[PDB]
């Protein structure tokens, strides 16, 4: 299944309001464990903070970006998360949601 | 002039959407330079990260806080910023804006 989430940047700290079954499977968290949280909950000691701070600034500026960073499953297993973030805008062009796709790393070294 | 800003936590990363003339004067930045930025842009090498972390936790949790931390004017001059951050709620009690007041540090030693 594709792993993706939908966040609402019109709510405080841009929480996840929808998580695909692929995301549950990739992360090992349940839907109850995920919803209402900011995506950074997957991050941990080895995550690159310069990439994180860079993504924060890009997201504030409503840019579409791709980043690759270390995340952790619920049980503490590290994985490379190739994460594509895209604003979704309403009919008038105003930001409504962000879509985050956790892309497969199979052909990514 | 009193120095303050209004941020919008219903836009990603709580950007500054209004800056008082006193804030322009305190920081040396222009209105154009400031709007759309997160307040953290004033921070720099000597800012205390434990205080930053503390503020960030309170803000994400929609709480009122007062902090004191080192900031930098546009030209690189350090000043102590005694910063009071307050949620502003709508008629129903839902978070609408944050007000951040940069209080005068004259009688704060």
Describe the secondary-structure layout.
The structure is a homodimer of 109-residue chains.
Chain A: E1 3-7, E2 16-19, H1 21-27, H2 31-34, H3 49-60, E3 65-72, E4 78-89, E5 95-103
Classification by helices and strands of chain A: alpha+beta
Largest interface in this structure: A-B, 15 and 12 residues
From the coordinates shown, what is the CATH architecture of chain A?
2-Layer Sandwich
Measured by DSSP, the beta-strand proportion of chain A falls in: 25-35%
Number of helices of chain A: 3
- Cα radius of gyration of chain A in angstroms: 13 Å
Helix content of chain A: 10-25%
Q: Which assembly state applies to the chains in this document? A: homodimer
Fourth-tier CATH superfamily name of chain A: PAS domain
Order of helix and strand elements from N to C terminus of chain A: EEHHHEEE
Count up the domains of chain A. 1
Q: Got a strand count of chain A?
A: 5
* Apparent shape of chain A: globular
Beginning-to-end CA distance, first to last residue of chain A:
22 Å
Name of the CATH class of chain A: Alpha Beta
Largest sheet of chain A: 5 strands, antiparallel
Q: Do you know the CATH topology of chain A?
A: Beta-Lactamase
Strands ordered across the widest β-sheet of chain A = 2-1-5-4-3
PDB class: signaling protein
Keywords: covalent flavinylation, signaling protein
Assembly: dimeric
Entry title: Crystal structure of miniSOG protein from Arabidopsis thaliana with covalent FMN
